[PDB]
Amino acid sequence: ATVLLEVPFSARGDRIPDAVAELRTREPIRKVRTITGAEAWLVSSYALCTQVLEDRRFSMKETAAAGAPRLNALTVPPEVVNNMGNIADAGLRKAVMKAITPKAPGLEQFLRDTANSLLDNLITEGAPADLRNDFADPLATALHCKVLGIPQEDGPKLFRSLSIAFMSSADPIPAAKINWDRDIEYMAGILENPNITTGLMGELSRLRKDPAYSHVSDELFATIGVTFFGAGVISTGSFLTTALISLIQRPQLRNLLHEKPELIPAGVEELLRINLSFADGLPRLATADIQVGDVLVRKGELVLVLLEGANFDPEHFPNPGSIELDRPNPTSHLAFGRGQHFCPGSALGRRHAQIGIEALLKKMPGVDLAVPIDQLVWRTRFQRRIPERLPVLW
Numbered sequence: 001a002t003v004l005l006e007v008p009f010s011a012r013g014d015r016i017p018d019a020v021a022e023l024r025t026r027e028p029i030r031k032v033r034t035i036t037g038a039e040a041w042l043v044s045s046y047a048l049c050t051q052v053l054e055d056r057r058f059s060m061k062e063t064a065a066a067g068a069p070r071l072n073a074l075t076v077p078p079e080v081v082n083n084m085g086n087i088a089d090a091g092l093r094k095a096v097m098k099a100i101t102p103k104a105p106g107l108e109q110f111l112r113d114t115a116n117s118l119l120d121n122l123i124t125e126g127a128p129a130d131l132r133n134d135f136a137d138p139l140a141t142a143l144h145c146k147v148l149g150i151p152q153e154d155g156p157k158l159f160r161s162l163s164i165a166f167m168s169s170a171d172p173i174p175a176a177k178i179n180w181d182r183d184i185e186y187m188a189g190i191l192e193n194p195n196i197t198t199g200l201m202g203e204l205s206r207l208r209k210d211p212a213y214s215h216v217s218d219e220l221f222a223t224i225g226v227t228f229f230g231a232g233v234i235s236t237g238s239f240l241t242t243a244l245i246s247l248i249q250r251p252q253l254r255n256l257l258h259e260k261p262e263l264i265p266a267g268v269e270e271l272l273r274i275n276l277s278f279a280d281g282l283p284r285l286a287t288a289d290i291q292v293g294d295v296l297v298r299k300g301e302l303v304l305v306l307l308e309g310a311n312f313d314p315e316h317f318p319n320p321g322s323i324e325l326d327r328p329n330p331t332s333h334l335a336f337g338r339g340q341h342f343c344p345g346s347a348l349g350r351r352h353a354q355i356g357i358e359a360l361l362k363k364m365p366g367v368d369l370a371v372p373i374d375q376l377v378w379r380t381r382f383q384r385r386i387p388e389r390l391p392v393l394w
């Protein structure tokens with residue numbers, strides 16, 4: 001006798017398990033057990049992943065309901081699961097979206113300058129360099145302080161909440177509440193700080209005093225700051241880090257993008273497609289009985305949308321493990337989700353990665369791992385897959 005198949009399969013972000021293609025071929029929706037002990041439906045084909053993400057009766061909001069089967073424990077207040085819904089209901093969606101595009105004057109130049117400075121510092125210090133802790137994550141942190149309009153010197157502490165805030169835990173995490181409450185207090189202070197007049201927090205500060213938004217809660221305004229910082233920093237830092245591994249392990253591609261940087265956007269789109277940064281499927285709770293492939297999912301059941309299931313599906317992306325810069329459907333991957341909850345930071349995330357990669361290839365054309373790839377230490381029980389350190393030489 002064996003127990004029900006457990007998720008997640010592996011915390012390694014440098015290879016997809018053979019099990020994924022096996023499940024997708026044999027049982028593209030199948031029952032699994034999560035770290036809390038709950039049962040869930042794991043969905044692993046492109047067709048079924050898109051079906052679930054495009055049907056709001058598979059609800060994000062309802063995953064926070066008391067007594068629901070859970071992927072992992074909440075690390076935010078339950079009302080904050082419906083963050084985007086709350087933002088939209090407050091009439092703030094257009095403003096929040098507009099503030100987090102990469103198109104503000106000087107933003108991309110700021111990204112380039114920051115990437116180049118970080119790289120120059122690594123070159124001065126000499127190999128080996130840690131491209132996660134001393135490149136990708138600081139670049140993400142600096143970007144998000146700029147986007148939010150908050151002081152650069154406040155970035156590192158906000159960042160250090162993240163190794164706990166984005167845990168994927170069976171049980172509630174006391175440190176997550178301590179850091180959440182402190183970070184909310186910080187953002188509430190930012191809204192009251194007369195110096196904060198630019199970026200997302202400058203805009204929210206002004207809308208807060210606009211009579212058209214007088215009944216929006218201060219709680220929501222502060223929450224937008226904490227959640228957008230956290231989601232953007234963890235997602236961009238983690239994606240860039242694992243994309244750098246994918247690139248470093250493909251010297252031919254590394255060389256091609258070095259030689260022809262105009263191909264970097266297409267390269268980043270493929271790096272997004274093959275990215276294993278999300279450690280768990282995207283959770284949804286069924287609010288009705290809904291047929292998904294061979295399974296009638298029942299009201300109240302948990303469904304997990306496995307992004308790499310979709311993104312490595314050979315029926316949608318032939319030769320899925322290969323980076324091909326001339327695919328006919330290149331942005332049709334699910335790296336940013338799909339439907340109601342499609343990532344609002346997608347353009348910014350693309351630009352962060354494109355600029356980071358462009359700068360690294362110019363400064364370190366000979367970049368290579370400084371340790372055998374198996375020596376990377378993969379963070380466990382976390383909402384992202386990331387190596388604790390990424391040692392390189394050049």
Ligand code: HEM
Pocket residue numbers: 060083084085100227228229231232233235236239277282283334335336337338340341342343344345346348349350
């Ligand atoms: C390459 C970098 C990024 C990746 C791969 C990524 C991925 C994703 C994915 C897959 C979702 C969908 C979650 C779901 O449907 O359950 C999502 C949602 C979200 N992302 Fe991103 N993201 C990235 C960058 C960013 C940035 C830069 C920000 C903000 C500055 C951001 C903020 C958010 C927020 C607030 C949501 C929730 C949307 C909702 O609930 O409607 N992300 N992201």
